[PDB]
Amino acid sequence: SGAIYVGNYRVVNRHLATHNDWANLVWEDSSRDLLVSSTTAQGCDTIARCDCQTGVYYCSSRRKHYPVSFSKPSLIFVEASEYYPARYQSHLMLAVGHSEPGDCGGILRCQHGVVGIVSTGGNGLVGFADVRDLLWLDEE
Numbered sequence: 001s002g003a004i005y006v007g008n009y010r011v012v013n014r015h016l017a018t019h020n021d022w023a024n025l026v027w028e029d030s031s032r033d034l035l036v037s038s039t040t041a042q043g044c045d046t047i048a049r050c051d052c053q054t055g056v057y058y059c060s061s062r063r064k065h066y067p068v069s070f071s072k073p074s075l076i077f078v079e080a081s082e083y084y085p086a087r088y089q090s091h092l093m094l095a096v097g098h099s100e101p102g103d104c105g106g107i108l109r110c111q112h113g114v115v116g117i118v119s120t121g122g123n124g125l126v127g128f129a130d131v132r133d134l135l136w137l138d139e140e
């Protein structure tokens with residue numbers, strides 16, 4: 001579990017969105033595993049606007065933050081899980097690292113701010129859903 005809280009937005013994995021998220025929906029994209037809902041309180045996270053390929057992510061299944069090198073956001077084939085059939089996931093970045101399903105939502109960040117959140121994994125790989133291209137998170 002986990003979310004990004006920026007301005008009056010809450011960014012969560014679409015497969016973990018609550019009824020309150022769907023009832024206050026701003027934007028959702030199944031192919032990216034992302035959903036954004038509106039909040040009453042203002043959040044403290046800042047989104048990175050960069051092309052960094054090194055950062056640090058939070059792994060709840062180890063209670064640890066790990067430094068990682070990660071690939072550029074791309075269209076990657078992800079195997080079937082309990083939440084999605086086997087399909088291509090877009091805007092996904094991979095790194096070598098530990099990840100279990102419940103690790104989804106952990107933040108990946110760099111020197112500029114939040115880059116994305118854990119969305120995929122298994123077998124010593126961890127995949128992050130990028131949010132750096134969602135410029136509208138910084139306004140309205």
Ligand SMILES: NC(=O)[C@@H]1CCC(=O)N([C@@H]2CCCc3ccccc32)C1
Nearest residue numbers: 033081084099100101119120121122
């Ligand atoms: N985004 C997707 O297509 C799904 C979302 C839910 C989900 O459990 N995953 C994978 C399954 C394999 C292990 C694993 C480890 C860590 C995190 C996520 C996963 C991918």
Ligand SMILES: [Zn+2]
Nearest residue numbers: 050052110112
């Ligand atoms: Zn950066």
